[PDB]
Amino acid sequence: VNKITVVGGGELGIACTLAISAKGIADRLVLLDLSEGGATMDLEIFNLPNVEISKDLSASAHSKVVIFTVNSQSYLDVVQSNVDMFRALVPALGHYSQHSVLLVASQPVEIMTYVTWKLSTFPANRVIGIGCNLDSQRLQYIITNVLKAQTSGKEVWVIGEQGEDKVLTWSGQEEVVSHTSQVQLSNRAMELLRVKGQRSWSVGLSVADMVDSIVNNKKKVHSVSALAKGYYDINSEVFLSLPCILGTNGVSEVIKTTLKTVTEKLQSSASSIHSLQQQLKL
Amino acid sequence: VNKITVVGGGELGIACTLAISAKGIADRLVLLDLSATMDLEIFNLPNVEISKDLSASAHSKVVIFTVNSQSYLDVVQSNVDMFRALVPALGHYSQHSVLLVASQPVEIMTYVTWKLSTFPANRVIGIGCNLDSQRLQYIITNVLKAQTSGKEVWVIGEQGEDKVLTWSGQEEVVSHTSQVQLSNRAMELLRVKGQRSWSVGLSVADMVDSIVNNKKKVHSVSALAKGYYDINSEVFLSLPCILGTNGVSEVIKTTLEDTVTEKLQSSASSIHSLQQQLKL
Amino acid sequence: VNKITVVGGGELGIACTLAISAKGIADRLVLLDLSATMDLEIFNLPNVEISKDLSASAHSKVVIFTVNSQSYLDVVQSNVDMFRALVPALGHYSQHSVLLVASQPVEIMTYVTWKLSTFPANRVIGIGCNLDSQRLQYIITNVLKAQTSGKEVWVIGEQGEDKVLTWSGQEEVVSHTSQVQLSNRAMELLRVKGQRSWSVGLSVADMVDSIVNNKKKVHSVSALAKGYYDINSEVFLSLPCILGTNGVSEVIKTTLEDTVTEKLQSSASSIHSLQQQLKL
Amino acid sequence: VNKITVVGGGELGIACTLAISAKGIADRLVLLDLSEGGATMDLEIFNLPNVEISKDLSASAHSKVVIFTVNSQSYLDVVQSNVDMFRALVPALGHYSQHSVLLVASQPVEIMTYVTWKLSTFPANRVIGIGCNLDSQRLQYIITNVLKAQTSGKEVWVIGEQGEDKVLTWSGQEEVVSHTSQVQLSNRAMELLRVKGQRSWSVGLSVADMVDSIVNNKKKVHSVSALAKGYYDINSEVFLSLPCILGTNGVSEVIKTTLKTVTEKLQSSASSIHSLQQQLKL
């Protein structure tokens, strides 16, 4: 039985909820509206099947996935304000669903994934962020369906810190792809992908797909924000987007890729995320 | 076969598609991308087709207009220019459809769609005050537990923050005392509640369901108001209509007040005047 | 003493204050902060006073309304609610002033200010099409080098992207052939040009200068249009008016066309209808 | 004779121009409209005194100050796009006014100041950014005028990377301020300053004040983005906001302040700015 909890009744939270329902992914879906005693009741009013709206954290109990979509001026103070909000919520919600995967969609995603990790005390493999999953699934789609490289397109990933750049790396789980093909396929795909955004509806579709893989234990590879210590010579406790196999029990495997110098982009993001994290009050 | 077309791949169009899919209303749903739309293709909903080709819409039961666009007139005229490129073609592809207008300003855009399509008025409706009415009835029937009275109150007229209320009497007499307490208590719970995309998306799904499954269910929708409330101009106002496969089959009667009339008549004047400045 | 009050410390209010200061128009300028305003205090312009106290405005020659606020009616009504709290008080502080309305929608907000202040209509004007008219005259006189003809063309009516043009004849006969070429060439150069804050700020400074220095200069401003163009409703439309200390002293005559009339009359209907829905 | 050039006819550029004119700071002011053959002509149409609008870079010639307000999707690509735009402009404009101060208001300010520095070849002391000048002048104003600490308020500065945090440091050019007073005055002032933005009109007023100090050689202290190598144990070529005396010839002196650990905030910004800069194509 696949119970899923979406945390936060803003646009993002409704987008996740509608996306999940549209595909019939959840047996029960609880949407937590944390607003002062709004329009979130429309989902019940219009009787979205198996959608329960609640203000009660305990309604989340026994979820397979809990999706954090809440968001709350200088950058540090904006992050800390979101941190303050997570402190009131994560510990409770971790306790209601101790066997769940926590999936963090709130921004800035790497930092908020770390925060959720620390507040919940869950093992790292069960605390992930949306990372570059949306970027990755779009890139692969373009290459497989638009450029018609049906196998090559499954082997390219967007990784690292979301929104900062588009760092590309290639896995090799199905075929060797020569460098000349890697370059043409990704330049052509980037033409189509450079201009696309991160609007709530897009993110909610991305989240629904990850949730589908987790609850149905698909063991499908997703570029998600995952604890990056021990990868790319990162030794700090920072989350970066990495190709991970997802199932019921979270990340079962981080996929190996081949990468040059470019790990410098990753290490600079890690260093910058870590410095900021050390300035936060949990 | 329930074929449904959503016109526009903006936030509203996505909201409508997902709400419709979520409820299992459509056998086939075509979403027309006129430019997040690729993301919906990636998501791969069964029986959802994404297309830039207008003709993909052919033979729909319902065509849902969700496209949206300076001074207010120029903002409206810019929306009208988009409809001019779209409505004629879409009317011709699905000549037996109901055209449902979710685009703002709804009353004017419904009239525009009516004129451009040449459809009979009973088959061109706007989302009107269906959202407000459903919330209001819900609150009364399910929160306040007035399971019959709550079915007889409607928000009508021109969509906006001022809710003009009226009562039908299709099932029950409701005393003025009860009408007042039930509507005051419910309004207390329908305060800042707005017109967000997903809310409109769900309102749309609901109406679409009554149309494609011929439910003959009453919704307050923007309908040609000529001959109602002593209005003689060609303007669309939200009125409780029985909705089915062939559109509005019946306008429900409700009981009068002169302050309601004054609001409906002044809404009609403003809408009609503005319509006279539009280039169709 | 030229005392001038700017009402509102938003982007427009700042734009107006800086434009006025830049030109040296005001002996004293009061900017009313109704909430970047502190930044203007830090900047410390001589003879500029920033205040939250309405009475700081007492004895102004001109009071410039720059405050700004759902459906269009609700957006307008929300602006009207702000004016209701403000106009009566400000009219009473500066009973000999001209009230100049820059707030959108300008025609309606001018009428609202007129009603709330109880001022004679000749002393309540809106920014109208002064900005478009000045650009147009400038282009013709200075770019196209028609130094006399360019003074006789005006943009009139309801402000928006459609520029309704008309010609005065206070200095020169201009042949139709010249009118057409000069206005076509100039329109080519006034294309995407918009209604940004700083542009309105400069238009305001210009008008304020004609008022406080009694220039008796013609500007196309939103003025009560009753008795002009067979309009009989109480609506404000942009018309070329001689502006001075005591407001509009004269409406300039221009030469007719029935398509111009039709645009002015239909603008008047829409504006009047909408005004009937407002709560003052 | 004080000729000043504003580069860019967007909102920022008009705001700078109106602010400068409002106070009669410039004898001649040239506004460079870089738009494809708009509403910038309103300034000439309405005859703002001594304002020349032009599309010709050469009209800038012999300026005392040139103010960069131009701005042109992933973060790196957004910055590089602004970089690309600066490459077309800075070298030319440096050559037209070889004795000027280049004042950078474009975002992200520290990176765009560095870019201008490198493109122009000017000495670092004549290439500065708006930094935290707006934050600083507001903080000092509140403390001197609102809280009535007329001397103490002149001794507190916002420094470092604009928008990331509010890093405060104290100079000691006029009086000792005890720690208890430093804490109360800045907490109370922060109550009033925490919620205020960086809108174009505010920034333009800030810029006009800096321009006033430079052209009239006031030798007035401003927290501006200045090359930070050799300060706070920073050894990289990065610009951070620092209290500098400004005159005709730019930064004549960096003011000494007292600071704890908190230089960690500065070093983390420097490290992050440097990493990003190394990824740019000049």
Say how far apart CA B110 and CA B87 lie, in whole Å: 11
Pairing verdict, β B247-251 and B236-244: antiparallel
DSSP classification of residue A235? -
Structure tokens at B227: 């001959």
Pairing verdict, β B98-101 and B124-126: parallel
Give the closest of C14, C134, C196 to D201, CB-based.
Answer: C14
Structure tokens at A113: 């994934």
D173-182 long-range contacts, Cβ below 8 Å, gap at least 24?
D173/D221, D173/D255, D175/D151, D177/D152, D181/D149, D181/D152, D182/D152, D182/D156
Give the closest of A47, A48, A202 to B39, CB-based.
Answer: A202
Range list of β-strands (E), D174-276: 220-227, 239-247, 250-254
Question: CA nearest B233: which of B255, B264, B263, B200?
Answer: B264
Structure tokens at B104: 């703002």
Instruction: Give D102-135 as a DSSP string.
Output: EEE-SSSHHHHHHHHHHHH---GGGEEE-TTHHH
Secondary structure (3-state) at A236: coil
DSSP classification of residue B168? B
Chains meeting D at 3+ CB pairs closer than 8 A? A, C
Q: Is the dihedral of CA A12, A14, A17, A20 positive or negative?
A: negative
Residues A97 and A4: beta-carbon distance below 8 Å:
no
Q: Which of D275, D278, D280 is the mutation pick for testing A, counting most A CBs within 10 A?
A: D275
Structure tokens at B131: 């959202």
- Per-residue b or e along B54-66, where b marks 16 or more CB atoms closer than 10 Å to that residue's CB: bebbeebbbbbbb
Say how far apart CA C34 and CA C230 lie, in whole Å: 40
Identify the experimental approach. Answer: X-ray
Any residues with CB less than 8 A from the CB of C177 and at least 6 apart, and which?
Answer: none
Alpha helices (H) in chain B, listed in sequence order: 11-23, 37-43, 72-93, 106-117, 130-138, 176-187, 197-212, 259-277
Question: CA nearest A139: which of A189, A201, A182?
Answer: A189
How many CA within 13 A on the CB side of residue A69? 28
Structure tokens at D235: 């050894």
Question: Residue D8: how many CB atoms within 10 A of its CB?
Answer: 24
Question: CA nearest B190: which of B140, B237, B224?
Answer: B140
Helices vs. strands in chain B: H and E counts, helices first: 8, 11
Chains meeting B at 3+ CB pairs closer than 8 A? A, C
Residues A115 and A90: beta-carbon distance below 8 Å:
yes
Secondary structure (3-state) at A225: strand
Say how far apart CA A79 and CA A114 lie, in whole Å: 12
Question: CA nearest C127: which of C65, C186, C180?
Answer: C65
Give the closest of A75, A163, A164 to D165, CB-based.
Answer: A75
Any residues with CB less than 8 A from the CB of B60 and at least 6 apart, and which?
Answer: B3, B4, B5, B30, B93, B94, B97
Structure tokens at A104: 């963090």
DSSP classification of residue C245? T
Question: CA nearest B86: which of B53, B119, B108?
Answer: B53
DSSP classification of residue C205? H
Secondary structure (3-state) at C167: strand
SS (H, E, C) B71-109: CHHHHHHHHHHHHHHHHHHHHHHCCCCEEEECCCCHHHH
Pairing verdict, β D239-247 and D250-254: antiparallel
Residues B157 and B164: beta-carbon distance below 8 Å:
yes
Question: Residue D66: how many CB atoms within 10 A of its CB?
Answer: 26
Residue that the structure tokens 């200390």 belong to? C245
Residues A206 and A224: beta-carbon distance below 8 Å:
no
Residues C266 and B277: beta-carbon distance below 8 Å:
yes
Range list of β-strands (E), chain A: 3-7, 28-32, 51-54, 65-68, 101-104, 127-129, 156-159, 167-170, 220-227, 239-247, 250-254
Q: Which of B31, B202, B208 is the mutation pick for testing A, counting most A CBs within 10 A?
A: B202
Any residues with CB less than 8 A from the CB of A242 and at least 6 apart, and which?
Answer: A131, A159, A223, A224, A225, A226, A228, A231, A254, A255
The chain D residue lying nearest C192, using CA atoms, is D38
C205-209 long-range contacts, Cβ below 8 Å, gap at least 24?
C205/C16, C205/C19, C205/C20, C205/C22, C205/C23, C205/C25, C205/D46, C206/C130, C206/C134, C206/D46, C207/C100, C207/C127, C207/C130, C207/C243, C208/C4, C208/C20, C208/C25, C208/C26, C208/C62, C208/C64, C208/C100, C209/C23, C209/C25
Residues C36 and C45: beta-carbon distance below 8 Å:
no
Residue that the structure tokens 């996505």 belong to? B14
Structure tokens at C75: 């957006």
Any residues with CB less than 8 A from the CB of A191 and at least 6 apart, and which?
Answer: none
Residue A5 CA to its chain's centroid (Å):
15
Instruction: Give all domains of chain C, ordered by start, each with its CATH number.
Output: 1-128 (3.40.50.720), 129-280 (3.90.110.10)
Residue D231 CA to its chain's centroid (Å):
18
Say how far apart CA B170 and CA B253 lie, in whole Å: 9
Say how far apart CA A66 and CA A6 lie, in whole Å: 6
Residues of C in contact with D199 (CB under 8 A): 11, 36
How many CA within 13 A on the CB side of residue B78? 11
Say how far apart CA C24 and CA C36 lie, in whole Å: 22
How far away is chain C from the Cα of D40, in angstroms, using its nearest Cα? 8
Does D13 appear as a known binding residue? yes
The chain A residue lying nearest B138, using CA atoms, is A45
The resolution of the experimental structure, rounded to one decimal in Å, is 2.1
Asked if D275 lies within 8 A of A279 by C-beta distance, the reply is no
Rounded (to 5) percent helix, strand, coil in chain B? 45, 20, 35
Structure tokens at B24: 């299992």
Question: Residue D219: how many CB atoms within 10 A of its CB?
Answer: 12
In order of D148, D151, D201, the CA distances from D141 in angstroms are 9, 11, 18
Instruction: Give the strands of the sheet with D220-227, arranged side by side.
Output: D51-54, D28-32, D3-7, D65-68, D101-104, D127-129, D220-227, D239-247, D250-254
Q: Is the dihedral of CA A125, A129, A135, A138 positive or negative?
A: positive
Does B259 appear as a known binding residue? no
Q: Which of B127, B161, B272 is the mutation pick for testing C, counting most C CBs within 10 A?
A: B161
Any residues with CB less than 8 A from the CB of C214 and at least 6 apart, and which?
Answer: C244, C245
Residues B241 and B223: beta-carbon distance below 8 Å:
yes
Give the closest of C19, C36, C194 to D18, CB-based.
Answer: C19
Chains meeting C at 3+ CB pairs closer than 8 A? B, D
- Please state the φ and ψ torsions of residue D272, each to the nearest 5 degrees: -70, -40
